[PDB]
Amino acid sequence: GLVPRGSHMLEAQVQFASLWKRLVECINGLVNEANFDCNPGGLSVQAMDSSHVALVHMLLRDDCFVKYQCGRNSILGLNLASLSKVLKIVDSNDSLSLRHDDDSDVVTLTSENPEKTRKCEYQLKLLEIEAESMGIPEMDYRSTVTLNSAEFAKIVRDMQVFGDTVTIAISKEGVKFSSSGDVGQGYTFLQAAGVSDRGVEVTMEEPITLSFALRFMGIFAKGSTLSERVTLKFAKDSPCMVEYGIDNVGYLRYYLAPKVD
Template sequence: MLELRLVQGSLLKKVMEAIKDLVNDANFDCSATGFSLQAMDSSHVALVALLLRSEGFEHYRCDRNISMGMNLNNMSKMLKCAGNDDIITLKADDGSDTVTFMFESPTQDKISDFEMKLMDIDSEHLGIPEAEYHAIVRMPSAEFARICKDLSSIGDTVVISVTKEGVKFSTRGDIGTANIVCRQNTTVDKPEEATIIEMNEPVSLTFALRYMNSFTKATPLSSMVTISLSSELPVVVEYKIAEMGYIRFYLAPKIEEDEDETKP
């Protein structure tokens, strides 16, 4: 028996919007500690990890660990039927092959039930080791989204370089090149406008902007984004979900080769 009641239903909607473009089908794993998901995109270049801790739910009951395979597009369709202010309750019986989403309007005068079929998905759960990152950049998520969007109109890849100067996003395309440098800025009035750079050593990595752009779909979840870079690890783009957990995107860097320099 599984029953999760989330007062802030819009949060689940935003989560779905953030990951449904990257992943088609995924297993949602429910345990006593929380509701989580880990999935790779179909090309195995990016990985998304979601955690919604049980504390964040108004009511959380999970009798035994359960893994529910869902088509995220279908789930997103169902969740779109929920109002932004609705309270969403997820329910599943043990051994059942369906999950039920119940939407309650804030005034309790409308209650909708949506039952969705589950699917069997072969999940490849990856162990993600804790790692020390060479550089960690915290910046406003909207700013990051803007940068990715802008750069993707010029090139396909972004080089993220963190130096003591700041963090530089650069790209090149047929029409030219672009460089955006964000300096550390902690003196703003609002903490959510700060750009904080922690750097142990300089790092420069190349990523596909296509993925970065789909990561930024999670921007509504958090005002800040944390980008953790290490030269031999995938970048981590993390959006904290207030009081509940996080959504993290891992993206394998592009392999840099020497002839990059020789290319025209």
């Protein structure tokens, strides 16, 4: 429309800061620095734990924000430790505008009350983070179980009293989480209770039984702060995946290698 532009603003603001708070918590659990791809499609974070066993892919679609503006595709490295420290002090119900200028070695967070009587502005030095080394697995999922996010969280926390490894067994009827160790042996069995209305949606293709490091399942289960339900997808000798939907305006997705023997 007879109008050009060489500079950047890259300013996106969410209405309720509680979202960012709850997210960073989740992902800081896994890694302490990460890149923030901002496309016009929305913000993504893709990052892998220092042991290259687990992967976290988070996407916040552009309809997630009350205002969003990412002309070109800039990438922003951030210290998540610091970012968490700042978000810890930001009121849940305040707004939060994340902003970056043309090349400015610094990103800025701006918070404001509903009533406009208080305004906060924090500035973080940015990094410096080498491209992710990749990559996401592809990869087709035979069996799929969906359950209350917080029950899931409880179950991992519970299983950890026994071991540092959980064994997940899927049957059409239900799913069984199992653990062993000094204290003894535990299991929690969840029945599938069909055909409607909400409470465990198994949907397998065959029986399938994999094992996983609880350390990481625990880090993932933090997701329950974002979604009332959570979905786990499995495939034989293949990374499982745990998915937490954000309100149709995004997702948080974790992938973890099975234990091998």
